[PDB]
Design a protein around this ligand. Sequence first.
Ligand code: HEM
Ligand SMILES: CSc1ccc(C(=O)O)cc1
Length: 393
Amino acid sequence: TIPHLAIDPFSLDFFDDPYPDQQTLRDAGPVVYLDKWNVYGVARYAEVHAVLNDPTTFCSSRGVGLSDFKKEKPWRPPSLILEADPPAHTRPRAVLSKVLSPATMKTIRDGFAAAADAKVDELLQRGCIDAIADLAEAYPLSVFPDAMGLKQEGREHLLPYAGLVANAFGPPNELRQTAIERSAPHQAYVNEQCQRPNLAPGGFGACIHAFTDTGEITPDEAPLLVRSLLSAGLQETVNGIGAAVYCLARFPGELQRLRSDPTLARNAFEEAVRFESPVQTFFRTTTREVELGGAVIGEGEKVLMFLGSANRDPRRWSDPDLYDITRKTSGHVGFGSGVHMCVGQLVARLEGEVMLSALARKVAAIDIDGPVKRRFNNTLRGLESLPVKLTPA
Ligand code: HEM
Ligand SMILES: CSc1ccc(C(=O)O)cc1
């Protein structure tokens, strides 16, 4: 009944151009079986959205990677939020939500915007830049570690650790094996940065430890929570910003619309998140036998959600492969959906907005003038190098 496909969604060939294979997965049926890894797959928006919003049946506590924690040991202690189900998920989720709250954005918005403006002014003095290293990477590195309260030393560990964590959600392929092999120095920096004496007062990390007397998290749970904010977000935001710059360069009519109305910057970044979906995939594990798209999925089965494919499903989006900064982006699953929907989404949107805002007000043209290189990761899609020439406004 269920179609069996041999597509490996974690192969380098798939990463190099996922979009044709994503259509094949969608059109094969609402639910597919991936013989390569013995997991079910859902690639349409309807089934992806439904799975994400049923956390009891499609749980996260048995891991959101390929590995089933009931069968294998997690490669690191489980995240108290990403790899937890309600009700254990609820109160730690509440703390991170309040730590990355609307009122917190109000405190950091001015500095994030001023740093974004200064960075763009700096790159314009140079003209020809790498939009990844010099912009998409440089800006989030210039604001997010400081907002976290991290020391100045050791920040070179942040992006390698983030990519390690992301690769480890994948199947036991070479990308995952080589990741976990290299984890040793990075996890030790992360170790020490999650401890309260090591986080600057006022930052995200200190605010997590200050929440340890409310009854929502204990003091011994705070280091793992700080780890969450060191294991997620930075690379995605970098990838999402680099995606927006790339799209503004390839869809030049959209930059002209952005220049003429800079208040489109927030939706311009949201549409970049939908268009590229920095987080391509996540797994769930069925806790019971369940019917999904006329399919019967047994207990203890891994279900692979193609978020990027759901964000390009023509059953849900008009012209899904086009970057449109005035598209109604509401409902895209680039940040997930339901109880686990990205708790850091306001931080990512703020960083993305003020960068695209600085570009909208200061840049006239963005022209690719060099070879574009892609970075491969079991979970994340993003560019490694994007040589562009920035023309000032
Ligand atoms: C473009 C930027 C980002 C993208 C595309 C993204 C993607 C996602 C997705 C899809 C999820 C859902 C995981 C699931 O349902 O299993 C998630 C959760 C999460 N994200 Fe983000 N994220 C981004 C930025 C950030 C930032 C900036 C932070 C931290 C400051 C962050 C921290 C987290 C955490 C801690 C979770 C776990 C939430 C939970 O399990 O309840 N992410 N992210
Ligand atoms: C790449 S999405 C993500 C990764 C790690 C965590 C965590 O460590 O809790 C949460 C979300």
